[PDB]
C-alpha cells in the first residue's frame with residue numbers, strides 16, 4: 844500500500860521509462876539474464892542467446908522488453924487497483940511460463956538497477972523508495988495468486 848505522494852513519485856519515475864520504453868525494457872531484460880542466467884532458460888526464444896552482445900543486438904529481445912514494460916506500466920498506472928490486469932499475468936506465469944516468484948524479485952531489483960544506471964543522480968532516494976514499494980506490491984499480489992494455485 845502506497846500513499847498518493849509515493850504513487851506520484853512512481854509515475855514520475857515512470858515518465859523516464861516511457862520516453863524510451865524499448866531501451867529501458869531491453870536493459871532490464873539484459874540485467875536479468877546476465878545477472879541470473881537461469882532465468883534465460885525460461886524463454887525458448889531467448890535461450891539461444893549466449894553472449895550479452897547477442898542480447899544487445901536482438902530486436903526481439905527489445906520487442907519483448909517493450910511488451911513487459913508496457914504491461915508493468917499499465918499495472919503501475921492503476922495505483923494498486925490492478926486486480927483485473929494482474930490476474931491473467933499471474934495465471935500465465937504460474938501455469939504456462941512456470942516462473943517462480945524468486946525471478947520476479949530478480950527483475951524487480953533489475954529495474955531499480957537500470958534506473959540508477961540510465962539516470963545517475965536523477966533517481967533520488969525518495970523515488971527509489973516509492974518504486975521499490977510499488978514493485979513489492981506487484982510481487983506480493985502475484986505471490987498471493989501463486990499460493991492459490993499451489994505453485995512453487
Ligand code: HEM
Pocket residue numbers: 882883885886887888910911912914915931932935936940942946947950
Ligand atoms: C515486471 C515483471 C513482468 C511482467 C510485467 C511480465 C509481463 C509479460 C507479458 C505481458 C507477457 C506476454 C503475455 C503472457 O504470456 O502473459 C509475458 C510473457 C512471458 N514472460 Fe513475463 N513478465 C514479467 C516477468 C517475467 C520474468 C521475471 C520472467 C522469467 C524469468 C518472465 C517470463 C516470461 C516468458 C517465458 C513469457 C513468454 C515469452 C514468449 O514465449 O513469448 N516474465 N510476460
